[model samples]
Target chain A: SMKIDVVTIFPEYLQPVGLVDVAVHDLRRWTHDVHKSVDDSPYGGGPGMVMKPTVWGDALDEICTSETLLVVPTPAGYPFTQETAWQWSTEDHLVIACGRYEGIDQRVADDAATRMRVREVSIGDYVLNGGEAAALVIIEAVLRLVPGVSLLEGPSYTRPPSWRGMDVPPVLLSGDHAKIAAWRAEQSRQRTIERRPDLLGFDSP
Target chain B: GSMKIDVVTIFPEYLQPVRQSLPGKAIDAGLVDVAVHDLRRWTHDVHKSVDDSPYGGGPGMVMKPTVWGDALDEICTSETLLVVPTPAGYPFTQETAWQWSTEDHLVIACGRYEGIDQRVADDAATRMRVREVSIGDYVLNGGEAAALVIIEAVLRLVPGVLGNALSAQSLLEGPSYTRPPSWRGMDVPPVLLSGDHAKIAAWRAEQSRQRTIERRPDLL
Candidate 1:
């Protein structure tokens, strides 16, 4: 029931990587000129061309409704996490606005703010060439959380009990369901702590 | 200056889209050279298997070290900056991208299954500048997507890639508006449309600060 729309200059760049129930829109479609220009020189002297407000404004006018959550990917935005993905999966619609060149005219987001909920989310602190790649990351993470789409089952092992001098923990082979569950929980927690201590409010040691 | 980037992944086609983006443009312009290699290419078996059950009884398989070792042996060199994407690595940032853009060669190893064998990263450290970096706190089915994220970020920072060189530097997310002046009920800030350059610059800076503070105060 989640309808997602990705508006980018390179629509082909967003071609399905096996993600289902999503649509890709070319931002140029909203351009009013024959050349389909969606960007222009920044008002204040700047390096890269900012995405024109009109194209994005027109695009949103046609696609967005009161229910749409406009998610813009940028390094300047809030950090995206598993918790954010889960929260967004419950939304009725997600409109990902992919900015190119310097970035989309900030006014587009400010104007869109008047009608819909706009969340400028960043996948990481690094800056991408465009928001298309980050949008793919967001879609992948969110799609898996949608009901009946799939469940993120934790780590699993196969037939070989031991390989390459590494042994499967004895708790798994002990045949005790309670202990196995407890061990798996501990493993998950320890791994999370080791890798993403931020999730548990503990800094990496 | 040009950059040499090599990507190793089980699903090489997953990265085919890069050919249509800026990195692809950079390649055509002779600004960068990118090669995508399949990890299975190094497997000596008929199965072309690259992953196996984790040693300590985990759910997903970990990429075997042997195949990775073979792949790295052929691809890596003293000049290569070996980047391995994992949830357990240090947080990747613009600072990291800036540092990597100065490197001569970058080889990204995309781990599938749960992850690559721990020994693979440990051993890689012996030969090249091995860095294990995570894009964010979320888990993905594989590192191929994360590699795309990292490659795009780094390549754009390379000189001669962007038409506007200054755009490569990190800037706060400030408001930008294009023609039409006003749309629907929203109006482009009067300061932006105002002819006074200094006033416009000051207003834009404050806009960037306030927006960043509201959405990402951590950035402050």
Candidate 2:
């Protein structure tokens, strides 16, 4: 399982992301350690100060292993994707440096990359107040990909009878793997096609 | 009146407490409606499942389109706007909430385990006036909390939901402060309490610009 080390100032934001649903409590079998106290800017630079590099560098240096894959959440970085999550899950360890304020010092990322494979990723083109929530998302997706970690088995097993007014699909009950696969592929493709075509590398999957 | 939002998920209990928070009050006032449905109900088997492994041999399981289709068909109508929250979807914005608050009803479809089949969302989009949205970037375990965020944001926008409509708008109205000159030895910006409307507005404007610039520069 991949190990994740989160470096952030606010540790409380990590709570919702840490706990999984009842059955999937241990979905994140990978060890996760949080290093807080990334402080505000000391220098009188721009309007907003950034997190100092030393604190983050110290945190990352201690948590990251040679085999770790480091990801820094930033607006200028590559977008996060299922493909990326799957790729990172293959690693033995992962470290995410969550940034706030003006941004982290360039040296912290540069230093962390020297010890492991470091990547700067954006959830999308939009910017957030902080990377804590986005880091949570990336971590959960990564945790789900871990082998033998998830409590749920197979796809399309239970359907919410009817919610408010919506109902689950009917074909899932046919118990036919071939048919189910075809339907899921089409659905996945269509969903991606309509909403996130950028990830598919084409207009339609 | 408050708005009402009904969410369909396998873990209805997971969302129970969420429905009782401040957002729950909007439902209580009849200006908002919050409901939860167990995705397992539609399944005939004892295992009660909703997702399966991907067909092309990928890493994770995908939610069944069959279940989603049936659920959407029964619940959605022209009056009820349907929303599918996903990572790849458009980012949810104050503008989106503004549009939703004007509607009489709204429903959210939260997904997990890979993601709901695309056809399910597409069918809902084409047949039930559904729109897909994402709250910020990054991913979540399920759409439930994201759905809650959207519901809370939108319900607060509903007319009369907040004693003063301006307060609701103020949450996103940039930065705000009140009371004593200093809290815990930290003083408020000097320009804020100057009592000069023009200077106060300018300071606030500058503060908003700087806040967004330094924090979410991409919004520029």
Candidate 3:
């Protein structure tokens, strides 16, 4: 069985969207103050407050185990991809730490590294308000790949083989499963090349 | 100028999370105005259908142009800037966010299934500024999630959203540390607490550059 834990300030925001085997934890629960503050202004001057290191320290202490793999969402991290999700689905436990404002104190990630495997990941090149939305994106992509959760096929069609000016490909309509599979694979590759040549390391088309 | 954003999608509830985050806070603060419309509302059929099979051979369905065209007719104006999220569009970036934040109004069309009819986007190009932007190289179930991504990135850049205006302009990618000074034997870099403003700034700048180089050389 696989277990995924999400740590965020807005726990409610992460849920009602549904995930197969995921738990959402509110980082505020780790805070121990009258106001339950989990972030403070950056040490050097900056526009937004940085998530406090203490809360993360406490949260990780209670949640992490030798089997845990921590994933931190940040712009200064490795790009997330289908390969990354496939690899992570095999882990016994995965913890996602969502940071806001300027970001979580860098030490939170630094400190966690000593005890368990940790990876800082980014969903894309663009910026987000916080890690919550990116975490959701990662979770959706990851969970769908998990075995026994759901079986996903490539693009599929149903009924009315022809609609308007479009028609279903003849190969798909053919009964030869082998040729149909090969055609789908090539189509996927060609579509990817046309839309995202960067993934194939090709210069602009 | 404040931004007026309209998001048209079948999954209107998918945007509820934005109401709990920074974009919602921006709307509450009156810095940006946002509205979500259901595309099915414009469909004349009893089924309220908005998608049909592609014109050429394809696996998935394509959103019909008529419903989308009708919706845009009611929402888009000559002054409006229309943004469509698709894997085939130009890459969205910090620079795009900066440019969009200055617009008076933006209409985001969320396409589903295979994608919207190509003519819908091509048609909008005639009278208004149409930007087809992709959040990344990957695909999503729909554009609702991508719309939320764009909204957050743009709203934060709006004036008065971030406490410090400089924060909006700066990369702010340098490592940040806070209290306890020491945790699990990891120490906050000495230079940050060194008390010399010039040296601290220089250290942060160097760290930011090194990180950008290592993680996203494209930014360099």
DockQ of candidate 2 compared with the true complex: 0.08
DockQ of the candidate models in sequence: 0.42, 0.08, 0.30
lDDT of 2 by residue, B1-220 (tens): 4466778887676564344434334446676556788777776457766786654445677887676767766777767788878765665766777777787767888888778866676556655677777775445688876765665557656665632233211111233333323433445466755667777766656766765565545356
| lDDT, candidate 3, B1-220, per-residue tens | 5878999999888888766654445567777778899999999799999887643346679887778889999999999999998766667888899889899899999988987866677668888999877786454677887888898888777776533244544342778887767767778788877889899989988998888777777655
* Clash pairs (backbone) in predicted model 3: A166-B55
Ranking by TM-score: 1, 3, 2
Which residue pairs in candidate 1 have backbone atoms (N, alpha carbon, C) closer than 3 angstroms, thus clashing? A106-B176, A107-B176, A155-B59, A156-B58, A156-B59, A156-B60, A157-B58, A157-B59
Please identify which of the two predictions, 1 or 2, would achieve the higher DockQ against the true structure.
1
Give the alpha carbon lDDT tens digit for every residue of B105-158 in model 1. 999999877887666666678767898888887777788889888888887778
Q: Estimate each model's TM-score.
A: 0.85, 0.54, 0.82
Provide the overall lDDT of each model, using Cα atoms, as 2-decimal numbers.
Answer: 0.78, 0.60, 0.77
Which candidate wins on TM-score? 1
Please provide, for model 2 over A32-115, each residue's C-alpha lDDT reduced to its tens digit, 9 standing for 90 to 100.
333434444423123455565545555665666787787888755655766787787677666777766556755566556665
Question: Residue B125 in candidate 1 has what lDDT?
Answer: 83
